[PDB]
Design a protein around this nucleic acid. Structure first.
Ligand SMILES: [Mg+2]
Ligand SMILES: [Mg+2]
Ligand SMILES: [Mg+2]
Ligand SMILES: [Mg+2]
Ligand SMILES: [Mg+2]
Ligand SMILES: [Mg+2]
Ligand SMILES: [Mg+2]
Ligand SMILES: [Mg+2]
Ligand SMILES: [Mg+2]
Ligand SMILES: [Mg+2]
Ligand SMILES: [Mg+2]
Ligand SMILES: [Mg+2]
Ligand SMILES: [Mg+2]
Ligand SMILES: [Mg+2]
Ligand SMILES: [Mg+2]
Ligand SMILES: [Mg+2]
Ligand SMILES: [Mg+2]
Ligand SMILES: [Mg+2]
Ligand SMILES: [Mg+2]
Ligand SMILES: [Mg+2]
Ligand SMILES: [Mg+2]
Ligand SMILES: [Mg+2]
Ligand SMILES: [Mg+2]
Ligand SMILES: [Mg+2]
Lengths: 53, 147, 128, 124, 49, 53, 53, 187
RNA sequence: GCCGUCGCUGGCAGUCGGCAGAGCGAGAAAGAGAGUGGCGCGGACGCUACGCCGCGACGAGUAGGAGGGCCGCUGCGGUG
RNA sequence: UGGAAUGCGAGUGCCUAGUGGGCCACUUUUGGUAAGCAGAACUGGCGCUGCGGGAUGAACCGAACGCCGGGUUAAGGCGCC
RNA sequence: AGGGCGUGAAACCGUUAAGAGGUAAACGGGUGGGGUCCGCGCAGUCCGCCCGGAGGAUUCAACCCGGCGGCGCGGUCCGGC
């Protein structure tokens, strides 16, 4: 959408501090599981080691 | 992915997709482009016409950079300069004409295909075409040469 | 005290015997699992008279009563207690079948739960 | 959105369970426990749950408030109804109808809050 | 009569739909003033326009 | 989507192929509800053919 | 010399990253991967900088 | 038995898109609803085009959308496309256009918005005009692909201006026998 | 009668409920439209829309093709 | 008044496996004394195809096949098998 | 698990049990006979409502207090984002 909320930073004691950060626009990009999968099942072929008889 | 391929549905059928009468022998036509003139002539004439013979002059030590000349058409000539150069000449009133240097963008010859917008230009280029130069005069503009 | 199903229709099956493989009787290397015979001169795949039969799609079961045990219930493998609450709103049409590996200490506290939930178990006296 | 993240959760969830030609779902607030857009207890903006009370007796009802939507901690409200078998099935009914709160789930909520009462009586 | 009544099926929407009511004939052949199984029999017997 | 990426060379978040992904709110909206034919939600199972003779 | 490694377009690895971040701020798409976040106070869980200390 | 032939019983049209993306499989849900629940043969064409492969819905150029929306009569209409609206750098003036496409390249959003036109989506269009009143369906050139130059009558055939498959093109790559009236013949 | 394939490019987002009014099978292109003057708090199921439902027609097959396998084998990333 | 009848949704585009030993029959038909021979034409078959009949049977007569209940037939039959 | 000793399949063989036996055996369709175990069969389903029949509660409605949540065209309330 277009409405970017105001997330609140949480102190290390769990309780919410005063600091706020506007939700970055990345958290509204399209969710594409097919693109995510196609990219994952190709990028993790790269860390593979050769093997052969 | 073998699990998607066609040899996984071909388990259990004797000839494995290749024929009972005519087997899948090794090379029943010769290897490669064999028989281009004898038994594969209908194919080398129906699909690769002109494949056999010589034509033209040889050129022994050809160097592909003496004949370097990339062209740009007039339609996308105005895309070499920024946008506030084509519109600044619109808002302009003193008749000034922007200098489009083409060999600076990476083209040597200017061919004239597209239409042009009505404003003057000064096209610096290495080689010009007759029509590319006439379409520039007919709009008002100069065809500078640069060696 | 049997746990009756929702409705118990009449189950009709177009065939009861298994579909044995061609020539699974003369040999021991040929198991009973079915393999469509693809030989040229074969007498089974030409559908001769009096030969073995072939699994057509015509033998399919009525969809209304397909996979349905003779107790009018469908079935579900249950690996632990938590997989019963999944089945507690399908009570009167599906049953539970504790897996083969669930030891008797857990299978007792699984039949115990399914008794409260009124879920029917097919093997409730299994291991003990 | 609901239909968006349902088109992501419809097959590659972790609560999805697929065996014996059936397909149930183990979501927290899924009542009827079956994998469907309508009864999924995590996708929508307003869901309903009917769990058993932590002690022996009672039925807890879990509504999902509107205001807190990305705050999982302060998102759900819970109310334990430890009453007779009929008042609790007129309280869930009012909770849903009179509030006009996800009203297509009411008979599902009663049918579940009855399975709990039935699974909390003394066995025979 | 025996044919149209007992074995009479209509090619409606390219579907062999059994002629069970006059509103299956009127709905298709109505524009020719054939609106009942009797107008149908009369059109077949007396070869009509 | 209006301010490019600063740390990358030229990158803007991928655009959206549809904005209001809530086709429930889309479908029960007065814009679309008015432009529909009445639902034909009656089931007409096969009529047994008796013999008019 | 089997082809072990695959290469992906950069704009597509970035599409996949933005799709794997836009999906980590949704309570359903995180509680469906299996994580036990029934008591996290807010999903884009931010903490003060002293945590790096 | 009946003596029919089942050669053509299975019509091969696309019952659904082959892609698995969920921002398309939601458009196809909304338009499958509009397609069946309205009597407008517009939605039926949009739905039938949302199935089509990436080679059957080709790109549009901004210039071809200019000259197809400049035709007399169709003013103040929304230009609907099912493919993408690419830029056309060889056009200098851009009017204001109401447009609705699946994609608009990041240099055609610029031009259209700086002109002053709107760029809707297919859900925005479905809310603006459900039955699709006031629209102009378009589609880019389908025979534009270089693939369609090798199709037709095979080369080496009287009056078959079909492009052959050659490794490289040059003096000595298929220019000798079936092309010269001198060396052999030509067609 | 049942299974399946094909076709209808069929139907279903209308579960529109005390902010209610429960319909779109009927031969005849189009509104159960607006305005302008003469007690008892109640109502089954559904909708994994890749889902569900209704209608007809059809069902041989070597070589070959295609699809669907919640058929099976071994390991990998996730998840139970 | 869409200018005969009857029937039926058509048009178009790529990619493409297998095949390129055939055989039989009515009718026409060439060589041969003829052949379960050699060779053509048209259609239908066998090959790729079960089923009822012809005792038996690649090709003849009927008839073409999802799995089943009732009824009726085809071609063939009805002393007994 | 007894010194080539984890598990210890198949073909093949021995013995015990059960049946059977002159058209080699085996096989598909159909039943019948006997066995083996299973149903933990052998007095046979429960569920909602209502009517009556006998009992038991610290109990219903309606009011009062406190909390919580939904909705609000609060026509157009305050302050936010
Ligand atoms: Mg085959
Ligand atoms: Mg072979
Ligand atoms: Mg092949
Ligand atoms: Mg070959
Ligand atoms: Mg080969
Ligand atoms: Mg030669
Ligand atoms: Mg043989
Ligand atoms: Mg054969
Ligand atoms: Mg048939
Ligand atoms: Mg066929
Ligand atoms: Mg075909
Ligand atoms: Mg078949
Ligand atoms: Mg050969
Ligand atoms: Mg001959
Ligand atoms: Mg053969
Ligand atoms: Mg044939
Ligand atoms: Mg035959
Ligand atoms: Mg004889
Ligand atoms: Mg019969
Ligand atoms: Mg006889
Ligand atoms: Mg041992
Ligand atoms: Mg050990
Ligand atoms: Mg041992
Ligand atoms: Mg003995």
């Amino acid at each position: 959408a277009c409405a970017r909320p105001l997330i609140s930073v949480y102190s290390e004691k769990g309780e919410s501090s005063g600091k706020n950060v506007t939700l970055p626009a990345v958290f509204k990009a399209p969710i594409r599981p097919d693109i995510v999968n196609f990219v994952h099942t190709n990028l993790r072929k790269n860390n593979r080691q050769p093997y052969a008889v | 992915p073998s699990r998607l391929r066609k040899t996984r549905k071909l388990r259990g059928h004797v000839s494995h997709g290749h024929g009972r009468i005519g087997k899948h022998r090794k090379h029943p036509g010769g290897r490669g482009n064999a028989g281009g003139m004898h038994h594969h002539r209908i194919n080398f004439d129906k699909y690769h016409p002109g494949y056999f013979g010589k034509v033209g002059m040889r050129h022994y030590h050809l160097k592909r950079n003496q004949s370097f000349c990339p062209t740009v058409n007039l339609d996308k000539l105005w895309t070499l300069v920024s946008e506030q150069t084509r519109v600044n000449a619109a808002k302009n009133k003193t008749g000034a004409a922007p200098i489009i240097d083409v060999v600076r963008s990476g083209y040597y010859k200017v061919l004239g295909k597209g239409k042009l917008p009505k404003q003057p230009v000064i096209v610096k280029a290495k080689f010009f075409s007759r029509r590319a130069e006439e379409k520039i005069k007919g709009v008002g503009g100069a065809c500078v040469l640069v060696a | 005290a049997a746990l009756r199903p929702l409705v118990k229709p009449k189950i009709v099956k177009k065939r009861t015997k298994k579909f044995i493989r061609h020539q699974s009787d003369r040999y021991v290397k040929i198991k009973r699992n079915w393999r469509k015979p693809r030989g040229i001169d074969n007498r089974v795949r030409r559908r001769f008279k009096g030969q073995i039969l072939m699994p057509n799609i015509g033998y399919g079961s009525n969809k209304k009563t397909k996979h349905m045990l003779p107790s009018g219930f469908r079935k579900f493998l249950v690996h632990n207690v938590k997989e019963l609450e999944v089945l507690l709103m399908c009570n009167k049409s599906y049953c539970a079948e504790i897996a083969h590996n669930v030891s008797s200490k857990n299978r007792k506290a699984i039949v115990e739960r399914a008794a409260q939930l009124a879920i029917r178990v097919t093997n409730p006296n299994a291991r003990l | 959105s609901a239909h968006l993240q349902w088109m992501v959760v419809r097959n590659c969830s972790s609560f999805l369970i697929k065996r014996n030609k059936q397909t149930y779902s183990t979501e927290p607030n899924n009542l009827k426990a079956r994998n469907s857009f309508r009864y999924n207890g995590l996708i929508h903006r307003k869901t309903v749950g009917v769990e058993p009370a932590a002690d022996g007796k009672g039925v807890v009802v879990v509504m999902k408030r509107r205001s807190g939507q990305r705050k999982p901690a302060t998102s759900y409200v819970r109310t334990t109804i430890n009453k007779n078998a009929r008042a609790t099935l007129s309280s869930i009914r009012h909770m849903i109808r009179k509030n006009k709160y996800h009203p297509d789930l009411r008979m599902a909520a009663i049918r579940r809050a009855s399975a709990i009462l039935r699974s909390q009586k003394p066995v025979m | 009569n025996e044919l149209i009544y007992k074995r009479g099926y209509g090619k409606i929407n390219k579907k062999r739909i059994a002629l069970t009511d006059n509103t299956l004939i009127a709905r298709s052949l109505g524009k020719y003033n054939i609106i009942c199984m009797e107008d149908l029999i009369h059109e077949i017997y007396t070869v009509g326009k | 989507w209006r301010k490019a990426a600063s740390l990358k060379s030229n990158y803007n978040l991928p655009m959206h192929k549809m904005l209001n992904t809530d086709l429930s709110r889309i479908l029960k909206s007065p814009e679309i509800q008015r432009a529909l034919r009445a639902p034909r939600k009656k089931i007409h199972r096969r009529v047994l053919k008796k013999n008019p003779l | 010399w089997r082809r072990w490694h695959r290469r992906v377009n950069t704009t597509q690895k970035r599409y996949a990253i933005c799709s794997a971040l836009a999906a980590s701020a949704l309570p359903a798409l995180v509680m469906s991967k299996g994580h036990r976040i029934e008591e996290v106070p807010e999903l884009p869980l931010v903490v003060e900088d002293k945590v790096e200390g | 038995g009946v003596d029919i032939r089942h050669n053509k019983d299975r019509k091969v049209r696309r019952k659904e898109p082959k892609s698995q993306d969920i921002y398309l499989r939601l458009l196809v849900k909304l338009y499958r609803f509009l397609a069946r629940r309205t009597n407008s043969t517009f939605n039926q064409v949009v739905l039938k085009r949302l199935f089509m492969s990436r080679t059957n819905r080709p790109p549009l150029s901004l210039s071809r959308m200019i000259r197809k929306m400049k035709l007399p009569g169709r003013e103040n209409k929304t230009a609907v496309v099912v493919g993408t609206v690419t830029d056309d750098v060889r056009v200098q003036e851009v009017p204001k256009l109401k447009v609705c496409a699946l994609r608009v390249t990041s240099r055609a959003r610029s031009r259209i918005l700086k002109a002053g036109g709107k760029i809707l989506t297919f859900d925005q269009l479905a809310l603006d005009s459900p039955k699709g009143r006031g629209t102009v369906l378009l589609s880019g050139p389908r025979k534009g692909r270089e693939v369609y130059r090798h199709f037709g009558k095979a080369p080496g055939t009287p009056h078959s201006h079909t492009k052959p498959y050659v490794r490289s093109k040059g003096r000595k790559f298929e220019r000798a026998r079936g092309r010269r009236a001198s060396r052999g013949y030509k067609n």
